[PDB]
Structure formats: structure tokens, C-alpha cells
Scaffold this active site. Sequence first.
Site, PDB file in Angstrom:
ATOM      1  N   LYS A 261       1.657 -12.195   6.646  1.00  0.00           N
ATOM      2  CA  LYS A 261       0.634 -11.443   6.801  1.00  0.00           C
ATOM      3  C   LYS A 261      -0.082 -11.114   5.430  1.00  0.00           C
ATOM      4  CE  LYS A 261       3.220  -7.002   6.924  1.00  0.00           C
ATOM      5  NZ  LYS A 261       3.379  -5.751   7.533  1.00  0.00           N
TER       6      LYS A 261
ATOM      7  N   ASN B  42       1.189  -9.063   2.434  1.00  0.00           N
ATOM      8  CA  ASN B  42       2.401  -9.970   1.838  1.00  0.00           C
ATOM      9  C   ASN B  42       2.275 -10.807   1.031  1.00  0.00           C
ATOM     10  OD1 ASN B  42       3.961  -7.683   3.105  1.00  0.00           O
ATOM     11  ND2 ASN B  42       4.843  -9.215   4.554  1.00  0.00           N
TER      12      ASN B  42
ATOM     13  N   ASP C 105       7.620 -12.518   8.484  1.00  0.00           N
ATOM     14  CA  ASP C 105       6.308 -11.564   8.060  1.00  0.00           C
ATOM     15  C   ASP C 105       5.396 -11.888   7.233  1.00  0.00           C
ATOM     16  OD1 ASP C 105       5.747  -8.426   8.577  1.00  0.00           O
ATOM     17  OD2 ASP C 105       6.615  -7.955   6.522  1.00  0.00           O
TER      18      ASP C 105
HETATM   19  N1  LIG Z   1       5.744  -9.196  -7.549  1.00  0.00           N
HETATM   20  C1  LIG Z   1       4.973  -8.162  -7.541  1.00  0.00           C
HETATM   21  N2  LIG Z   1       3.988  -7.810  -8.231  1.00  0.00           N
HETATM   22  C2  LIG Z   1       3.030  -6.847  -8.288  1.00  0.00           C
HETATM   23  N3  LIG Z   1       3.232  -5.928  -6.998  1.00  0.00           N
HETATM   24  C3  LIG Z   1       3.834  -5.987  -6.251  1.00  0.00           C
HETATM   25  C4  LIG Z   1       5.084  -7.125  -6.351  1.00  0.00           C
HETATM   26  N4  LIG Z   1       5.901  -7.057  -5.436  1.00  0.00           N
HETATM   27  C5  LIG Z   1       5.403  -5.977  -4.694  1.00  0.00           C
HETATM   28  N5  LIG Z   1       4.446  -5.437  -5.275  1.00  0.00           N
HETATM   29  C6  LIG Z   1       3.584  -4.010  -4.640  1.00  0.00           C
HETATM   30  O1  LIG Z   1       4.404  -3.192  -4.465  1.00  0.00           O
HETATM   31  C7  LIG Z   1       4.350  -2.875  -3.100  1.00  0.00           C
HETATM   32  C8  LIG Z   1       5.509  -2.889  -2.134  1.00  0.00           C
HETATM   33  O2  LIG Z   1       6.472  -4.046  -2.417  1.00  0.00           O
HETATM   34  P1  LIG Z   1       7.180  -4.617  -1.301  1.00  0.00           P
HETATM   35  O3  LIG Z   1       7.891  -5.787  -1.737  1.00  0.00           O
HETATM   36  O4  LIG Z   1       6.188  -4.969   0.023  1.00  0.00           O
HETATM   37  O5  LIG Z   1       8.144  -3.247  -0.584  1.00  0.00           O
HETATM   38  P2  LIG Z   1       8.577  -3.076   0.683  1.00  0.00           P
HETATM   39  O6  LIG Z   1       9.386  -4.368   1.238  1.00  0.00           O
HETATM   40  O7  LIG Z   1       9.363  -1.866   0.875  1.00  0.00           O
HETATM   41  O8  LIG Z   1       7.182  -3.195   1.604  1.00  0.00           O
HETATM   42  C9  LIG Z   1       3.648  -4.382  -2.468  1.00  0.00           C
HETATM   43  O9  LIG Z   1       2.927  -4.077  -1.326  1.00  0.00           O
HETATM   44  C10 LIG Z   1       2.780  -4.577  -3.584  1.00  0.00           C
HETATM   45  O10 LIG Z   1       1.476  -3.914  -3.670  1.00  0.00           O
HETATM   46 MG   LIG Z   2       5.819  -4.405   1.618  1.00  0.00          MG
END
Ligand SMILES: Nc1ncnc2c1ncn2[C@@H]1O[C@H](COP(=O)(O)OP(=O)(O)O)[C@@H](O)[C@H]1O
Ligand SMILES: [Mg+2]
Lengths: 499, 496
Positions: free
Chosen positions: B287, B290, B285
Site C-alpha cells: 500500500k 508502506n 501488505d
Molecule cells: N527504513 C525507514 N526509514 C525511514 N522511516 C521509516 C523506515 N521504516 C519505518 N519508518 C517510519 O516508521 C513508521 C513505522 O514503521 P513500520 O515498519 O511501518 O512499523 P509497523 O510495522 O509497526 O507498521 C513508518 O510508517 C515510517 O513512517
Molecule cells: Mg507500518
Amino acid sequence: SRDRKYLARLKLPPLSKCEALRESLDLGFEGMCLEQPIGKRLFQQFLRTHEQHGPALQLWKDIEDYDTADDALRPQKAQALRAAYLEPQAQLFCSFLDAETVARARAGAGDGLFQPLLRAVLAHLGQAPFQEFLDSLYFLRFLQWKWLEAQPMGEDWFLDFRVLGRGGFGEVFACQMKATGKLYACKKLNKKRLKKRKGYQGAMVEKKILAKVHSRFIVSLAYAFETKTDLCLVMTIMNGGDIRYHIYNVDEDNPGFQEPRAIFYTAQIVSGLEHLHQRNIIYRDLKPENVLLDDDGNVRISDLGLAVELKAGQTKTKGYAGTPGFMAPELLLGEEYDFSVDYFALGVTLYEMIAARGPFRARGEKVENKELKQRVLEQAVTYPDKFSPASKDFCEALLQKDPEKRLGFRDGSCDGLRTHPLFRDISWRQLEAGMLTPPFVPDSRTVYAKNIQDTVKGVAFEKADTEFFQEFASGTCPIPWQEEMIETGVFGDLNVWRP
Amino acid sequence: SRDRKYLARLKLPPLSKCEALRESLDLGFEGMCLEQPIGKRLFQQFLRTHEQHGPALQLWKDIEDYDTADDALRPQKAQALRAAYLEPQAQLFCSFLDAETVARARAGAGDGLFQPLLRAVLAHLGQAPFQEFLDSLYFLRFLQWKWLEAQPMGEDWFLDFRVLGRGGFGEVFACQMKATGKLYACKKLNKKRLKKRKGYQGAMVEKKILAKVHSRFIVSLAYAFETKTDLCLVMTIMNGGDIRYHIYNVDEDNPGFQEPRAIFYTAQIVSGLEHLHQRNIIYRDLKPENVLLDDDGNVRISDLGLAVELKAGQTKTKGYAGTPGFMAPELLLGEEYDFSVDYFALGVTLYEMIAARGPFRARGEKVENKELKQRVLEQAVTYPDKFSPASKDFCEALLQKDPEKRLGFRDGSCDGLRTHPLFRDISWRQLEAGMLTPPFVPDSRTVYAFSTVKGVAFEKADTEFFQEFASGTCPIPWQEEMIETGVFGDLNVWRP
Ligand SMILES: Nc1ncnc2c1ncn2[C@@H]1O[C@H](COP(=O)(O)OP(=O)(O)O)[C@@H](O)[C@H]1O
Ligand SMILES: [Mg+2]
Ligand SMILES: Nc1ncnc2c1ncn2[C@@H]1O[C@H](COP(=O)(O)OP(=O)(O)O)[C@@H](O)[C@H]1O
Ligand SMILES: [Cl-]
Ligand SMILES: [Cl-]
Ligand SMILES: [Cl-]
Ligand SMILES: [Cl-]
Ligand SMILES: [Cl-]
Ligand SMILES: [Cl-]
Ligand SMILES: [Cl-]
Ligand SMILES: [Cl-]
Ligand SMILES: [Mg+2]
Ligand SMILES: [Mg+2]
């Protein structure tokens, strides 16, 4: 001048070499954290890095300060301590103390002030904080120091460089511990000579006593070992000469001491005697020539080979022992006796310090033993004009022929004796702490001793002899060794965590 | 700033509380003294306090310095290091090296310099000096730190103060570790929502991978715990927004990146990819959205729920999984695949960074799954004038329909990939150490950026999975926290 080869042998061991020591040492709070200097130091280090014990640590240190402060500064120090630790909103308030202990310490201005408080403080530190310590790295570091303390430190570690005097069984040498540079006296006892004259018992008795007592008024044993020819005792160096020399040979025209000088030594001797009597040792050989001066002019009692140690539940001994002219009547009459004998000898000693002669003989009078015995038993001592009323009276109280009526050791102390008008101007607290200026200080540039000038046949050693030697050669004394490590910087150098 | 109440709970324990831990602890030299920051630190304290290991310690510290120095500074550091440690009568001459290593380090050049020396140094330190350390107070101190590391540190230790983003199963919060003051991202996954949408597998895979990898180019997990309502992942806070946002939302009328900026991120993403691939993990994944940016401008890959860890001695896998438009042909054809799929996504990702659009779709062009699939499969990508010779060729090499013809992971590395001319002007060594200055430093002053579910009751299997997930604290990052925030220094004192 630290010899680096031996200095290099003072290294802390890996922890796996301390496993045996852990399972065998006396882990008593009092012994480990109060009496053994490295143990105290490490325990205080443990308390210092553990915030919650900061009050207990600080109070403890501040009581010790109070106990050795000058008189004029004590009221102020009493005030600071009470403000720091005994007022309830103080940052270092000691909330572990019972409120009764606290309230009591905030009142009064007496000699006992802060002694019940110290007990309380030490009682507390002997519980949880001590347990926590035993479960810390700090204790493991103690084991490392005890391991090093147990390592062989026999003859090769000492460089003899002068003769200080001569005893019956060999010479006493000024010597140096090579690793650290510290100076000691080394009493050498010739093995063949010892066996021949049956001197084992006295040799062993002196050593056992010098090992177990720790007084600033008695020479301290640091090390006891054997060599091919000698048994050796390494002890406190006393460079100042003995009282006899100072009485007669320092300023021949005016023999004897001024009164204040004689009183000072008496007080120091009294303190050494008390220390023996509290541990049930009768000295039986107090005399001017066995009281040695150090470089600062403070004295200590020495030569303990005639001593006896009363066993548990024994209040009297018996026996013809000592130096003629210093032996009490009760002793001479063949009666049982206790500590009383030493106080009679203290009297003869004081007598001699002031009068520059013994109380039973004229100068150069050389008499039959029986004649001297009858004088001690029957003849009233006379006191020349040199004696102040106080000196006369004190001597009269000590030279009392009936030991029941003689000043001495009662109720486990010499406190009664300390109240005598003769000690009017002595601060006993400061005397005991070693804070007083001695009235006479020996010149370092002077040797205070009569001049020095340098095999027995048909003695083979049986098993029982070598067994006695190995018992005698018990090795390193913890407390003095730890003092040495600290004094000379070795503890500082080796006790590191990060530079 | 620290909260003293929770700081109060960071105390070293009595030694006897560490004996169970000592029985169960299975760490060799490398694990203890090289990989774990505190272990390394205490092992180095040990060497520093024992004169005989001085040379080893200093040569080690100086090789690490040479390894991270600017390029222009290397020749002088090489000469200084040779003169200090490799000459026979230098004070810190390293006697323990064999003359064959001494000669070899004494006369080389290039990127490999001193690595054979470091191996010899580390091999030496892992013998007697390490055995000495295990028998020292410094090892017991390490056991005490490990005890502390293992103590319950759940939701009460974390103050959430702002929302960073929204995911499928909950919000991600900016939070503070109360004891140390350190800022983190706390990804919350709502329990009932996970169960309802059958997301356990994806939650756990993300958690496990983040726990077991330790790269500067992948978000690091410090803690995993559960609250009554949530599973929680406390991980590296990434405050610089994500690459998607920066491509399109920053300077809207000039979307996409200047090429060097694109190359910098490609280089960093590749480093992340490589770390995963070396540990038999496929991302699946990659992209723009991410790939997150931190405060300095450095990037990390995130969102590992669609990833897969190959079992030991497994070289390829199957499973339709990923984001449409990034899933590689072989995946889409239903064939077995390996890491190759991630390099294809990297192709798509880089392409987008330059073109401000994906390779298969015009802007706002939304198509059927079958149509996109068919384009990924059949369509040859076209490159506008914004691509340079080097950009185009790199994307071409990454976007090959056949995984066998595609640039990627060979002989356990991306070293082949690194040699592409696109990376003409990149010091891989410095990049991999985090030394290079990022070409875009995000502003502090900019922030570059549910409903309770019904019918869900929890059974044995559910709360068991939740306890399995809630594995607690991650050693390396926890140790990093303690050292960074000064707690290590404060509690490691012997006499203040
Ligand atoms: N380590 C981090 N630091 C800052 N923001 C984060 C971090 N991890 C995730 N986010 C924010 O939260 C959102 C959701 O996290 P994510 O892991 O992508 O959830 P999911 O797996 O449900 O897509 C991300 O797209 C980003 O905007
Ligand atoms: Mg996400
Ligand atoms: N600690 C000491 N410091 C300096 N000299 C000492 C010390 N101990 C003994 N001496 C000197 O050596 C002599 C003999 O020592 P001593 O212990 O009295 O032996 P003995 O038991 O044979 O009488 C003493 O008279 C004194 O001169
Ligand atoms: Cl009082
Ligand atoms: Cl009191
Ligand atoms: Cl500790
Ligand atoms: Cl006489
Ligand atoms: Cl090399
Ligand atoms: Cl150690
Ligand atoms: Cl696209
Ligand atoms: Cl679409
Ligand atoms: Mg004697
Ligand atoms: Mg996800």
C-alpha cells in the site's frame, strides 16, 4: 642485462606450497626479523601498518640512522630522537620502554649512547609484536619468499663472462645471475683435480665459513652448487685487485703504500679478523694476496681453505699450516696456538705494505724452509726510515715472537688493538659501517691483475665422492640472496598487494 | 563523521582467530566473489595483480559497464568491448573463451548482448582463477573481514538522533553507526508490548525476510539486535516520506501524481514485488504508506510483518491477512492464493496514486468490513478522466477479481508485466540498476512526515525468541557499509 626467461621463474608460490617450510624453518626473532633482509623488511611493513607499533618502528629506524650519521650531525640527531620518543607527551612516545631505559637514554653523550636503548627496543619487538607478526599475512608472505629462495638455482642461472684469476683447482670467473643481473665471482673447483690432491677438507672448510659469516670485510657466499666437472662457489665480486698487486705492480717505481693507505687496509683487515675470531675461526692465511679490493676500494679477506674452527670448549689448535714467511713462531715451534697466529701475519702484512718487502728476506731471496724458519724464530725485524714511529711500534707489537705478549684478540674483541696510536685518525664506527672514503679507489677502466692465458688421468668417482659433492652443493644462502632480490628491484616488483 | 573509539574496534584480527570461521565457512564462488562486495573486491584485487587474468578481469568490468550505460552510449561501448577483448590479436584478447562464444558476442544486438559472454567469463573465473584465489593471501584477508563482520555490534554502536516515524510496537529512529558514520533507520519493537499483543510471529517474519533479500527496491537490514527493553532492526534510512503522504499531503489542492511519476513508482514497486516473488515470499501488505522514498527520490517497499515465505515446493497458501481494501478477492473468499494477491494491491496502489482516492471508496467514506469486502468482491472499478488509455488498462489488468485472469508473475518473472504499454517510456535495465533520474527529488529541508505496559514478565521461551531474533549483522549490507565509508580502503592497505 636481466635474461627474462630466468626472471620469469622468480614468482611467488601459492600458499599451499609453503606448508612444509612453515613446519621446518628456524622461527627465531633475531634470525628472521633482524638478520634476514626480506624478513626485516616485511616485519617493518607489519609494524608500519599497525599504528600501535609506530613508535617502536620509528625509534628503531632513527637509532640506525644515528649509528651511521656523520659525527657533526650526531648531537642534533640525539636531540631529535629524545624529543620524538623519550619525552612523555611526544606523539611518538615509546611507552613500552621501561622508565629506567628511557631516563638513561636521555642522558650522556658517549660512544655507547642508544645501544642499551636499541637492545630494549629489539627486546620488546621480539615479544608481542613479533608474535602478532607471525600471526599476520606479512609472515605468510615471508614464507613465500623463503619458498622461492629454496628453489633450484644451479649452474644454468649463471653466465660466466671473464676470468678474474686462477686458483689451485680451477679458475675464478666474473659471472652474472641471469634472472637479476647481479655480478658475482664464481670460484670453480675441478672435481677430479680436487679428489686427486685430497682437497675436500679445505674446500668444505672455506665454503662452510663463507656461508656462516656475514661481514663486510670477508667475501660473502651467495650460492654453492656442483656441475658435471666442478664444484662452484658464487661470492662477492672483488674487482679491484689484491693487495700484493697493488704493492708491487701498480706503480713499480714507488712500491709500497703511503702510511694512511696502509692503515686503512689494516683497520679493515683487523675488522675481518675480529669477525672470524668472535666466531672461533682461526684464519691461518692472512697475506697481501688474499686481501681483495672491491670497486670502491674497500678490502675483504678471502681464501679460507686453511682456516680452522674451534669447537665449543676448545681454546687452542695445532698444526703446520699457512704460507711460509707469514706463520707465527708458536706455530713453527709445534706448539698449541689460537688467534695469535693471524695477528703475527697481520704484522708481516702491514710490514710488506709499507716496505714493499717481507721482514725476513731480501728481495728475490729464495731460501730453504729451515733457514726461513730460523729467521722467524731467532731474527729481530729491522725497520727502514719509511716507517713512522706508530707503524714501527704496531708492527713490533704484532711481530712479537711470544704470543702472550702479542697484540691481538682479548676479551672477545680487538678493542685493545683499536686504541693503538696508529689508528688515531680512524673513525672505527664509520669504518665498520663502510662510510669512509678509501684513500685509493681502483680505476674501473683498469684490470688490476696479472694477464690470463688458458683432465687428470685415472680418477673414477666412488659413492663417497658424490656424497661429498652433494653436501658441498648446499645451494642458496638466505641473506645474500635476499640482498640480491632487494638490491636489483625484484623484491619491489614481486612484493605487491595492489598496483 | 566517525567516532574514533568505535572506529578503534574495527581492526583486522590475527589469522589464527579465523580458523573456526574457516572450518565452518561454506561459500562457493558465486557467494564469495560475486555476491559479497568485499569478497568481490578482494577477488578482483587478486586478478589485477596476476597479469594472466588481466583480460578476464577487464572484460568482466567492461560488461558490467555496458550493462549500466545510458542507451545512447551502448553501441560505442559494444564496439570498444568487441575490439578490446574479442579480436584475436588485441592485447587483452580473451584466449580462454571458446570460438563459439567469441563469434556469438562478436555480432549480436539488443538487450541480451554480452550476457552469454558474461556467463562464460564468470564460469571461467569460477574455475582455476578462483582456485588460485583460495590459495592466495587475498582469501585469508577475506576470512579476516568475515571475522570482523561477525563481531558483536549492538546498541552501543548506534547513536539515535531523531524520530522518523511511529509503528505499532515503537518508534523508528534516524541513527548513526558510530564507527563509520553511516546513517540508518532503527526500527525499535518494545518487548513487553510484542508479548502482550502477540506480535512475535510478525516481528520475526519481517526480520527474516529483510535479512535474506537483497534488492534496491526493498529496505535492507544491516543489523538485528536486542536492548533490555527492545528488539531493534537497523535498516536502510528512507528520508523522502512515504507515497501516501506525497499523494495527499504535499500539494494538497492538486493531490495525486502526474502519470509519469506514478509509472516510475509502479515500475520500482514491481521490481520489489518480483524480487520477493522469485524468493517465494508474498508481501500481503502493498500500500502507498508502506512504499518509502529515499533522498534521491527512489522508492522501496517496507513493513514486511504480514508477509509469508512459502516452504520449498509450496505454490499456494492460506491465511486472512493484510489491510482491508488491498486484500484480493481470492484471499477474502478464503481460497488458496499465491503472489497474485500482491499485484491486486499494486492495482489499488497505482489507482490511488493517479486518482487521489482508492477504487472502492469515495473520500472520507468509511464502511463496514463486510461492505468493503463485498465491493472488492463484486464492484467493478470506474476510471475518471485523469487516467489515460494505458493507466486504465493496466489497473484493469491488475484489479481482475479472478487471479487467473490477472496480470502478475509468470514463468519465474514479471517480464510479461514489463511489456505493458504503460511502460512505453521506461528503460527497465537502467531502472533496475538505479540509473534513471527520479521525477521528484525530495527536499532535505522538509521532513515529509506510547506508555509502559503492565503485567508482563518474561519466561525462558520469551528471551530465547529474543536471542533468535537478535541474529546480529548482515554480511552484504555490512560489507557495503565498510566499502562505502572508506573503512575497507583504510584497513586493507599493505603499505601506506
Ligand atoms: N527504513 C525507514 N526509514 C525511514 N522511516 C521509516 C523506515 N521504516 C519505518 N519508518 C517510519 O516508521 C513508521 C513505522 O514503521 P513500520 O515498519 O511501518 O512499523 P509497523 O510495522 O509497526 O507498521 C513508518 O510508517 C515510517 O513512517
Ligand atoms: Mg507500518
Ligand atoms: N671474490 C673474488 N673476486 C674476484 N677475484 C677473485 C675472488 N676470489 C678469488 N679471486 C681470484 O682468483 C684467484 C684464486 O682464488 P682463491 O680463492 O685465492 O683460490 P685458491 O684457494 O685456489 O688460492 C685469486 O687469487 C683471485 O685472483
Ligand atoms: Cl652516554
Ligand atoms: Cl641508551
Ligand atoms: Cl594481516
Ligand atoms: Cl719475508
Ligand atoms: Cl554475448
Ligand atoms: Cl598471494
Ligand atoms: Cl478504496
Ligand atoms: Cl473504511
Ligand atoms: Mg685456498
Ligand atoms: Mg509491520
